[PDB]
Amino acid sequence: MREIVHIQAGQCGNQIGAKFWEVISDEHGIDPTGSYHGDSDLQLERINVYYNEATGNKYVPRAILVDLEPGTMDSVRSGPFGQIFRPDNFVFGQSGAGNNWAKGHYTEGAELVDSVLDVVRKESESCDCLQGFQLTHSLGGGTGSGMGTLLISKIREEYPDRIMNTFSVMPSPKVSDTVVEPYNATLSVHQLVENTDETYCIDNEALYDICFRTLKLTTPTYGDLNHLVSATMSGVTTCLRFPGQLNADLRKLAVNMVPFPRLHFFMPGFAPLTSRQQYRALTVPELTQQMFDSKNMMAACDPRHGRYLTVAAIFRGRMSMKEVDEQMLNVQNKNSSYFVEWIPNNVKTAVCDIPPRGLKMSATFIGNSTAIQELFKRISEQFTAMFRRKAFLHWYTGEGMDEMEFTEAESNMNDLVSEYQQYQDA
């Protein structure tokens, strides 16, 4: 009865969050009203991990929707599965955060965090055995970035012995709202380095490239990007939601994927990424090759530029589990130079019989690679380009921050980059 508490904050957090509940609700056979209508036992066996059961065989997502402006949350309530969420779990202000980390973390957000913690406390108090929390948010805005990390800090203080997991969307000039995104992302990464156990790095630069180069989408929209994120979030949580030879939880994942506390930022991967060919069935060899190909990575880092510390691969669908072990062992024994030698057997494989909607089989990749440093270098460079001239700082000093907190944020991330570089040459 290991329950997970889901939290989605800000525009991006609530848009990928809503899509996540639509996807997995369909897989578990739950309709927009909360009534089950599946046809398999595997759908309900571990349904308690993400859903609460209300009277009348109704299933209510254990989700808490948070934002400093009502705009996006009103869309969720009007969306397809809007009526499935607990109405009391909508916590929102009216001022917004203006794409300002300081407003979400120090001023506007501080005024709303307590009421969020009240809902979180009500959900946890009715948990048989709370695993921890998973948060969806972007790092480039104000609410998800600033207030999101404020929530993480306060959740940890009240539940120091629970796992904190996040799906964090990294900003990219290729898909940009404002110029201060590097400032907000640099400030958040330090919070994440300190107060999370597992962070799925979802890079908007990679999502755009996958839509443009692979899926052949000339003008990707946020909807297109969120389609990939939904597919990934369904993938990395399959072994938490369904039963099988490997019934995983958030803590065993952290134990096997995080050899050092600060290095807990994962590269997610998904296959197939077919462009609308959606009828052509993939073979286990093809899933394995694409799954490890950088073109299927959601972080925009070249894995061959670093080394894998640990890897988790999940195969969904009815396939030859024998041929799965053969292809996995083939990838490792062929490119054994990209897997560190001081962690034996660092590639683990799991199989789930139920494939995602619209696919005969899929493969999800969770890699803890030192090549993730390229992402933090990218952010650090964009950060420094402006900070060297103190550009746009007035948006932040006007909310009580001083330049020192920025100097420390950059230093902390450069350290993070150096730590990854240390183990890439071990």
Binding site: N256, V258, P259, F260, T310, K322, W342, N345, N346
Partner: protein, 437 residues
């Protein structure tokens, strides 16, 4: 008649225990509801099967077992399985949160909260024993509970039952069969803390059971069910001398006497034959000579290693089925003049033989075919140290970088326990080398 209490810890120990007691019932004619029609002494008796089964006034034969797991999902299968009527609730102990593959979490953090409850339930069963011999502990090396809580239980058992023997059935970690990356850490942590508390331990490398299932049973991707049924047969042939009339290894003390002259070197190698596929209707029954010869084939050993490059300290042969002492000696005489069987100078070159006329019992619908004669060899060969060397090498690779160490230090363990445990293993490897080289 002296009783033996079995203790199953963690998923591996519980599921392996569930397979053994299913087999015990079939071998003793005990139905799932605990009734035993062939038992004419209703509600009591001092028979040989009473070493493992107590009796109620209603004629139910209750295993002298206790299942312990830090999470409830695996032991809930027992509460619902075919043999749910066998055990009573007090025997089944479960927690809320498992050890997350972390020895420190099962030994210190979580174990400290449940150790007393387990010891109490054990005292309940001990209070039904006129002459308790000791305990049989089933557990995995790599699991957080199987490794962390077992070593804690073993220490407390040495305190509360100082004069009793303790035997282990341990599952050695194999990457091919679902394994965490830190299982080498846990294996070495629990071996160090349990070493001076176990009188005799039978290691079973999942790598061995896996390949035996793939090559002899023609199973492409063996499951735990496949592995456990094979392991239960082997465990059965080892514990048979305790459950049936006989004169060889009739009490836990004899295992130490016949298989372990050096207390630290108490890990006998087990070899089992024949393993015939059930899907094979036309099975050419193997002879006494052919099955006894197979006992010296590494492909039939519970741990893959080369006894040819070691030294035997003791050897026991446990036959079940149509075996007569004459055929066994004619087979030994032939295998001596062909195989490489070197004993240490301070030990006689011989074999203690035990024969049970009841051929092996196979679970109906299983993967193993019924045979007319099987044999399990228990040899204390220094070659089993190869398994310690493999394990200690993987330990050294990760610990040189301190990988994952923070998860253990974060539960109250100190980094020094790692080094202490590894040093004890270094001494263990040296003891084997000084005995067989």
């Amino acid at each position: 008649m002296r009783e033996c209490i079995s203790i199953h810890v963690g998923q591996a120990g519980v599921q392996i225990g569930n397979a053994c007691w299913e087999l015990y019932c079939l071998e003793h004619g005990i139905q799932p509801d605990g009734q035993m029609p062939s038992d004419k002494t209703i509600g009591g008796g001092d028979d040989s099967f009473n070493t493992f089964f107590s009796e109620t006034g209603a004629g139910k034969h209750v295993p002298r077992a206790v299942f312990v797991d830090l999470e409830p999902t695996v032991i809930d299968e027992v509460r619902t399985g075919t043999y749910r009527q066998l055990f009573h609730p007090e025997q089944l102990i479960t927690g809320k949160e498992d050890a997350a593959n972390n020895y420190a979490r099962g030994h210190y953090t979580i174990g400290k909260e449940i150790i007393d409850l387990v010891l109490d339930r054990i005292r309940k069963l001990a209070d039904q024993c006129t002459g308790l011999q000791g305990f049989l502990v089933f557990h995995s090396f790599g699991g957080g509970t199987g490794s962390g809580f077992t070593s804690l239980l073993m220490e407390r058992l040495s305190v509360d039952y100082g004069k009793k023997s303790k035997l282990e059935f341990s599952i050695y970690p194999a990457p091919q069969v679902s394994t965490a990356v830190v299982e080498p850490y846990n294996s070495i942590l629990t071996t160090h803390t349990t070493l001076e508390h176990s009188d005799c331990a039978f290691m079973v490398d999942n790598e061995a059971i896996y390949d035996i299932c793939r090559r002899n049973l023609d199973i492409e991707r063996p499951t735990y069910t496949n592995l456990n049924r094979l392991i239960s047969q082997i465990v059965s042939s080892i514990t048979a001398s305790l459950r049936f009339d006989g004169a060889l290894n009739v009490d836990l003390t004899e295992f130490q006497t016949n298989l372990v002259p050096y207390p630290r070197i108490h890990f006998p190698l087990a070899t089992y034959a024949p393993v015939i596929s059930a899907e094979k209707a036309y099975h050419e029954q193997l002879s006494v000579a052919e099955i006894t010869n197979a006992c010296f084939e590494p492909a039939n050993q519970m741990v893959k290693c080369d006894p040819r490059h070691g030294k035997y300290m003791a050897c026991c042969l446990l036959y079940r089925g149509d075996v007569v002492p004459k055929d066994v000696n004619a087979a030994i005489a032939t295998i001596k003049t062909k195989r490489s069987i070197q004993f240490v100078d301070w030990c006689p070159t011989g074999f203690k033989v035990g024969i049970n006329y009841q051929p092996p019992t196979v679970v109906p619908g299983g993967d193993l075919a019924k045979v007319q004669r099987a044999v399990c060899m228990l040899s204390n060969t220094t070659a089993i140290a190869e398994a310690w060397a493999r394990l200690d090498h993987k330990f050294d690779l990760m610990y040189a970088k301190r990988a994952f160490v923070h998860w253990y230090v974060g539960e109250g363990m100190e980094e020094g326990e790692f080094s202490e445990a590894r040093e004890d293993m270094a001494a263990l490897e040296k003891d084997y080398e000084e005995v067989g080289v």
